Amino acid sequence: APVLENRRARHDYEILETYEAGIALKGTEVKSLRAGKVDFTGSFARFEDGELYLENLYIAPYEKGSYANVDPRRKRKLLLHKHELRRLLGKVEQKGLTLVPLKIYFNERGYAKVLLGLARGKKAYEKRREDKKEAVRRALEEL
RNA sequence: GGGGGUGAAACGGUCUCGACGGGGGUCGCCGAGGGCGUGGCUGCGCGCCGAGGUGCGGGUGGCCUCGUAAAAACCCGCAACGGCAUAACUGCCAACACCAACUACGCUCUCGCGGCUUAAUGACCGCGACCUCGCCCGGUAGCCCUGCCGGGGGCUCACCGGAAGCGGGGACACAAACCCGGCUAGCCCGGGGCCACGCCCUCUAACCCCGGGCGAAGCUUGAAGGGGGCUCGCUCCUGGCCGCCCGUCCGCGGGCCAAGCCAGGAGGACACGCGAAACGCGGACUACGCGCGUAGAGGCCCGCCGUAGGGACCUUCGGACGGGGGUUCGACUCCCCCCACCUCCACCA
């Protein structure tokens, strides 16, 4: 369906700030999300950058047999002017509240976008002893 | 085996709200103290020799060219530089140290009886020692209080000793081999007077200090002065020397002074100064030597905004429907047409 979502932050983690970005991609992914595939892969980013390069994300290839696609979890440009794209960047390197795809989707005109945020929900902070039990019961179920 | 469903949530209005990459602006980064001279000064300039570099340069012999000409080298560096990146740790496998129960501890440092400190048990303390040390009194040797008034402070186990008082043991680690407290160093022999409006003989000082004497030998008082003994002119300052010629070199000329002498005067010292004159009109600047013309890395102005060049950035404009060509804003669709993988079709050798 042309609006779906990525639940890897909605029972697992969830957001502290939300943003969205258009993502150019080579047409070979379009029918698969428009029909009904979704993703849950761990996106990351690396970002001493002018824009904000996302690392990893499946829209899925469209398929019958082999088709003409190339792996979707490659780098993609992210639409938004540099200054407020630096607002999405503003906390991305804090290693604890971290970049997540929230909802892959298309706009009304059929071009692809991703709702994005920065999130946590397992533990108050990692690498502590105390709150790891809440990261394996609770933060794989609730939020 | 081929033809075609189809790889899009819109017949076209399909301008992902917003990326990039060319613009519109910039103009700071950006081969640069935002400049450069195709130009000028001082009676027409300027020297008496000297410049240059390999890719980018530190260094280095004046290699060498060689004056109508400021024209062609090199050892070594730059080469060297050990650059990773989120949101879920609790798993695999590992460990920790002194004493008097007893042999010195209260026992220094060779012996002998009691005590009783864990039984320190004849070494401590109350005491019995040859031989040495100490207190306390006496002597050769040591005495640099060398005045009197109260007391000649007064003697050292050094060299010898327990006698007039006495004690430990092989070390009880000394103070006197020079001392306290009062009168001007008294009592008294004796040296001597200098420096600050120059000093002292006279003076604020019985003239005096006090180095010093009797158990053994020689420098001052002064805060102020008329005259004298000392090194003095009381003490200093009035005119000849000297310092200087004004863009680089000078034609034509030549006086005075900050200040000591030789030598006269003036105030109370050497506490701080009484008016004749050092430059001025010009003679050149290779146009009077070797030379020529912008000499060849002096010193300041005058004239061209030196280009906005040399660069890279924002927003903003141009966008990914499997690719690939039409094209009124895109266009597997409206149309030509390439590949996946399926769906429909005329066949045995």
Side-chain angles (χ1 to χ4, degrees), chain A residues 100-111:
Chain A
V100 198
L102 306 178
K103 308 182 59 57
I104 57 177
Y105 71 126
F106 298 92
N107 58 31
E108 192 170 359
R109 317 293 205 168
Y111 312 88

Side-chain angles (χ1 to χ4, degrees), chain A residues 17-30:
Chain A
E17 287 184 354
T18 49
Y19 297 87
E20 86 95 14
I23 42 170
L25 54 69
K26 186 198 179 304
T28 31
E29 306 183 1
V30 170

Side-chain angles (χ1 to χ4, degrees), chain A residues 11 29 33 35 95-96 114:
Chain A
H11 69 286
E29 306 183 1
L33 180 60
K95 312 196 173 302
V114 57

Side-chain angles (χ1 to χ4, degrees), chain A residues 26-102:
Chain A
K26 186 198 179 304
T28 31
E29 306 183 1
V30 170
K31 195 86 183 198
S32 255
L33 180 60
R34 290 198 191 192
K37 288 117 183 288
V38 290
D39 184 27
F40 304 102
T41 63
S43 310
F44 292 96
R46 198 59 257 165
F47 42 61
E48 36 281 287
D49 184 3
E51 53 178 303
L52 183 45
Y53 279 108
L54 194 68
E55 296 276 54
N56 313 287
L57 180 61
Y58 282 73
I59 303 302
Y62 196 49
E63 61 204 53
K64 286 176 190 178
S66 304
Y67 255 66
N69 351 72
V70 287
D71 192 27
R73 49 158 293 288
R74 69 188 106 91
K75 284 186 169 59
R76 304 180 184 226
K77 285 199 66 93
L78 269 67
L79 281 66
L80 211 177
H81 303 322
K82 296 181 183 61
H83 312 300
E84 288 299 290
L85 190 56
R86 246 117 305 278
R87 272 291 291 117
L88 175 57
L89 209 156
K91 281 175 301 306
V92 81
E93 189 59 305
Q94 80 166 104
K95 312 196 173 302
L97 276 296
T98 301
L99 211 294
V100 198
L102 306 178

